[PDB]
Amino acid sequence: STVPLEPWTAQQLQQATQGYWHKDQIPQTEIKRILTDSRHAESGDAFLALKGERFDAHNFVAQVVANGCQVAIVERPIDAEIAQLVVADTRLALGQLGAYRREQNAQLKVIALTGSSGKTTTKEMLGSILSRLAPTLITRGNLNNDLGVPMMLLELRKEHQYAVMELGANHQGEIDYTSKIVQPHVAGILNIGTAHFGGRDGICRAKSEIYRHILPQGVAIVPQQDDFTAEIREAAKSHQIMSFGAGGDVFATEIELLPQSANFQLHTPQGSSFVRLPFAGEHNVQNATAAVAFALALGVSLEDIVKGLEQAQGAKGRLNFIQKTPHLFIDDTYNANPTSMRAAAQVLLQQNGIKVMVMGDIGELSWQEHHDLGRDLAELPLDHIVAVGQFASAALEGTKLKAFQTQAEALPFLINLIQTHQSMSFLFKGSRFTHMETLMADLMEK
Numbered sequence: 202s203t204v205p206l207e208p209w210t211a212q213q214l215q216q217a218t219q220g221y222w223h224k225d226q227i228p229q230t231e232i233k234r235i236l237t238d239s240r241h242a243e244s245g246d247a248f249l250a251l252k253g254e255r256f257d258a259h260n261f262v263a264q265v266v267a268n269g270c271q272v273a274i275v276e277r278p279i280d281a282e283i284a285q286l287v288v289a290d291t292r293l294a295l296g297q298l299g300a301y302r303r304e305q306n307a308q309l310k311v312i313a314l315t316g317s318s319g320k321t322t323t324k325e326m327l328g329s330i331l332s333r334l335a336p337t338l339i340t341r342g343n344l345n346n347d348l349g350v351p352m353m354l355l356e357l358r359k360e361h362q363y364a365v366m367e368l369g370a371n372h373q374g375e376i377d378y379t380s381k382i383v384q385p386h387v388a389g390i391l392n393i394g395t396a397h398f399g400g401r402d403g404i405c406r407a408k409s410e411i412y413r414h415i416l417p418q419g420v421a422i423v424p425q426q427d428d429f430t431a432e433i434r435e436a437a438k439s440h441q442i443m444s445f446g447a448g449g450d451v452f453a454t455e456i457e458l459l460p461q462s463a464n465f466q467l468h469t470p471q472g473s474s475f476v477r478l479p480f481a482g483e484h485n486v487q488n489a490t491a492a493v494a495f496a497l498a499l500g501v502s503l504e505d506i507v508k509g510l511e512q513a514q515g516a517k518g519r520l521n522f523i524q525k526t527p528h529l530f531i532d533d534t535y536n537a538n539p540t541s542m543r544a545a546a547q548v549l550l551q552q553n554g555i556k557v558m559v560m561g562d563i564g565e566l567s568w569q570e571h572h573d574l575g576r577d578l579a580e581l582p583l584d585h586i587v588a589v590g591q592f593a594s595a596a597l598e599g600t601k602l603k604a605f606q607t608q609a610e611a612l613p614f615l616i617n618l619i620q621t622h623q624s625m626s627f628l629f630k631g632s633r634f635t636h637m638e639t640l641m642a643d644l645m646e647k
């Protein structure tokens with residue numbers, strides 16, 4: 202990474218991993234950064250060599266030596282001029298290094314959260330709330346798995362008073378592993394979504410591992426309106442509990458959905474407040490109520506929580522409203538599924554001007570799915586539907602909808618829509634692998 206980092210001593214590296222220095226060659230200078238990318242390691246870094254499926258970064262140690270790196274963390278001694286901390290397993294050692302740094306920072310109050318949807322948005326909301334009060338570390342991008350979580354904890358500094366760790370795992374045992382490294386004071390689940398083997402039951406059990414390592418006198422956060430609310434409350438029973446959602450501790454009433462925001466009355470065990478939330482859509486109201494519950498569990502005042510929500514900003518590709526007078530471009534390109542795709546159309550339906558929904562394929566599904574999506578969206582009063590990809594033909598089945606196999610062929614059509622019409626409102630969305638944000642940037646170019 203590239204943020205300011207607190208250095209490591211050779212002694213700290215060894216103590217965290219219980220490794221040994223090869224041939225007793227011990228670095229006499231401090232280590233400024235631990236990284237896994239052989240392209241970027243330089244003088245002062247420690248290169249930690251990971252292996253995985255058909256890959257082994259031990260193969261690239263000569264590259265980091267040629268580039269000036271003089272410290273490596275490895276599973277086996279390499280014949281090279283570099284100090285080497287030898288460990289049994291470098292994936293485990295990375296976990297231990299993150300766990301050690303988390304433990305050394307005893308001043309921290311720590312949140313861990315998971316869920317099928319809304320993790321990143323809820324994390325950003327908490328980040329806004331907590332960063333107003335003190336230095337706060339939150340998960341960057343998708344660093345939320347067995348490697349990403351400890352990589353994030355390496356960025357902890359003595360100045361940090363708060364940490365908000367997103368945990369992304371979906372499979373049995375994975376959340377136990379990362380949440381044990383994190384050692385949260387407050388943790389919980391936002392929702393259980395649709396089936397990925399194991400079924401939704403398996404997803405529930407996996408994410409319920411997040412309650413196992415909550416620290417003494419901590420708090421478990423539970424969703425009060427989930428299909429698995431009762432099972433999740435049982436999983437959290439060894440901890441003090443707070444809930445969010447209708448019928449729960451923290452909930453919203455008189456919700457008003459505006460074109461780029463949402464108004465509602467917020468209710469909590471610490472009092473109530475109106476909230477002018479600068480996020481669009483009912484799902485983001487739900488994410489706000491979860492952030493409120495997490496923040497109250499850390500003792501933040503309701504007043505500071507509302508101030509944090511009202512100035513919070515969304516992650517990239519999550520309903521970003523981009524004004525390009527006299528046109529609007531909504532960037533919702535981060536990902537897609539059949540449910541969220543229909544939800545996005547509802548947001549576009551609230552905008553002024555000629556409404557054009559540009560959509561790419563939805564993965565992990567498929568033909569019948571797009572057939573019904575193209576049918577349902579065509580019944581909506583959208584002005585134009587531009588379907589791009591391998592299943593655009595399916596959506597065409599069931600004037601309003603045009604289908605393109607490639608983006609290259611879709612770009613002139615979108616350009617022609619400008620000419621054919623008067624302000625336009627575009628919304629762009631597709632699964633991550635379709636990266637519809639290039640087609641959006643390409644239309645915006647001119």
Ligand SMILES: Nc1ncnc2c1ncn2[C@@H]1O[C@H](COP(=O)(O)OP(=O)(O)NP(=O)(O)O)[C@@H](O)[C@H]1O
Nearest residue numbers: 316317318319320321322323369484487488519541
């Ligand atoms: N609470 C929610 N319930 C249902 N869908 C939601 C919710 N919040 C967001 N979404 C949808 O999920 C998309 C991604 O939201 P995001 O906050 O990035 O979730 P995430 O849980 O971090 N995803 P991921 O890290 O890829 O597993 C949004 O663009 C919405 O379409």
Ligand SMILES: [Mg+2]
Nearest residue numbers: 320321343367
């Ligand atoms: Mg995420």
